[PDB]
Chain A
């Protein structure tokens, strides 16, 4: 599911699922 264009909430959802208990940082301007 990750090997596609992922924007906005779709990208954050992928981060959430992939990173699991680690969490993640979402930095769209950097």
Chain B
């Protein structure tokens, strides 16, 4: 999930935007 992708590893814009409505 987002924690694994952005907190425990380096985040990206591509992955943040997947969580926008």
Smallest distance from the beta carbon of B4 to chain A beta carbons, Å? 10
Q: Which residues of B contact A (CB under 8 A)?
A: 1-3, 6-13, 16-17, 19-21
Could you list 6 further interchain pairs (A-B, Cβ under 8 angstroms) beyond the known A19-B16, A22-B21, A27-B1? A5-B7, A11-B2, A11-B6, A18-B20, A19-B19, A23-B20
Q: How many pairs of A and B residues are in contact by the CB < 8 Å rule?
A: 62
In the complex, which range does the number of interface residues on chain A fall in? Answer: 20 to 34
| B6 / chain A contacts, CB cutoff of 8 Å | 5-7, 11, 14
With a 10 A CB-CB cut-off, give which of B1, B12, B16 has the most chain A CB atoms: B16
| A3 / chain B contacts, CB cutoff of 8 Å | 10-13
